[model samples]
Target: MDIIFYHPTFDTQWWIEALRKAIPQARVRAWKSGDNDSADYALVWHPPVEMLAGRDLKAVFALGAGVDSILSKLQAHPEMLNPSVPLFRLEDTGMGEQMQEYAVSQVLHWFRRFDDYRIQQNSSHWQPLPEYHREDFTIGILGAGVLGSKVAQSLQTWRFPLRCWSRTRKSWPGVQSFAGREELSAFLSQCRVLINLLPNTPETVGIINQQLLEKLPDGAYLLNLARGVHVVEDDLLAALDSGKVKGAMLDVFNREPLPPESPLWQHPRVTITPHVAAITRPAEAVEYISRTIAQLEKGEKVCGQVDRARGY
Candidate 1:
């Protein structure tokens, strides 16, 4: 077996070495320009059009949960990869835990009034505010996929009322689920804090406009760990100014490196992170990829296969 690999930022030699070590029977090499290697499988992230344009491969594996980069590459060059070729994305590996940890920390930051305390301390004001009841501090999560569900489940133990909204109805022990467009408003209305974990899709792009933001209770908090395209930056700023949203912790943005001129940089109520909620560790990736390859060799179906229509 042969595997071709590429990642925009990760070291190619390290990956090639690790992959070869993990799959002793397989030959692994990094992809380069103008090279036509008839590898059986490809492990890549944001590969160039030429890499797949004329290659016949068994399958392609994406290095991350989101396949937008890969999808765009294919969209630009439709004939790059045959329709029959499947594109599989990485599963939990270790992202689910990281996501859950980030969600819980943010939720606690708001619940414990740490943001408020920071402001108070700056002015040397010794004031104690009333406690917020966990029951009343309902958390509403958007999207109930693997990462979303992990976040929801982790919050359950903290005793904050949980609600989730997804395209399809979901039922968890104590979670209130709202499905489809019709139930979105209802879900938003009941949430005290809104966390976005929805995938990037045509229907989901710009879904977090002013209308949706207005649905949350006054002074609601927001945490967007998913794609930046899901939320309209202008709408979010307007809501923050109006106090419709008290504050936001955003890990992703529409434009990465978040352009210096963007007002979000200085917004007092906004907290920005450089899209690090969940990082794909190389060792975990190798393990997951090897397991999936083993399953494929035995003609067994595996999860995390991308569905172009659903756009995940």
Candidate 2:
């Protein structure tokens, strides 16, 4: 089998070498070599539509977690006739650990009012407050996937009051899980800190709207680690401005390189990080791909395979 490497980056070579070890007979080639006819699979990071036109490839594996960029581009040019190929995504243990670190850090920051101390530094003021306890605050997680579950478990270890909500009910010891759209309002009302870790799907798009934000306890903090599209920007801005929510720690945004003119940059209550919550490690990602390819060779189903119906 032959695999073409597209958008080769610093990490691509390492992953390619790793894959070569798994499939000894597999041939690795540059994506731009004009050798599509010889390739059985393609590891892609936004390949040009024309490059894939009329190709007989087995599958197209996404280098990263999100496939929105590839899907959006494919949908734009209707005239492009590329073969329908299965798409696979990378899921590894590194994703869970990275998410746990980010979630725990954000929760602790909110619980201890770390931002308030930073503001005091600029004003040269020494303000002390009564000690805060995590046990008193409730944290609501929006998604209960691998990443969410890991975070929930980590926070639970600290004895932080944790509640998780998903489209379906999930039972975890010492953690309350709620499901269904009707229960959303009641769930949001109880959380003093809300963390969003949902995948970008039709059902989740714009899930954090004005009405939902209003349901949050007054002066609650929000930690958005999910895709930016999940939260309506205008509604979030309004909520922050009105002081309905205490503040927000955002890792993802609807727009990349969040424009300098964008008001979010200047918002006093907002803290933005360049979408680094969970990075797909090349070593672990290569292992995941190797295992999946091995499963294909053995005629066994691969875990974490994308479900087109759900559009993951």
Q: Alpha carbon lDDT of residue 280, candidate 1?
A: 92
Q: Who wins the TM-score comparison?
A: 1
lDDT (C-alpha, whole model) for all candidates: 0.91, 0.81
lDDT (tens digit, per residue) of candidate 2 on 153-176? 999988988899988899899789
Compared with the true structure, the alpha-carbon lDDT of candidate 1 equals 0.91
Q: Which stretches of candidate 1 lie over 4 Å from their true place?
A: none
Least lDDT summed over 10 consecutive residues: which range in candidate 2? 77-86
For all predicted structures, in order, the TM-scores are: 0.98, 0.90
User: Model 2, clash count?
Assistant: 0
Deviation from native of the Cα of residue 149 in model 1, angstroms? 0.6
The global Cα lDDT (0 to 1) of model 2 is: 0.81
Residues 41-153, candidate 1: write the lDDT tens digits: 99988888888876778889999989877887777788888888888998888999999999999999999999999999999999999988986799999999899899999
Q: Which 10 residues in a row give candidate 1 its minimum summed lDDT?
A: 68-77
C-alpha lDDT of residue 249 in model 2: 87
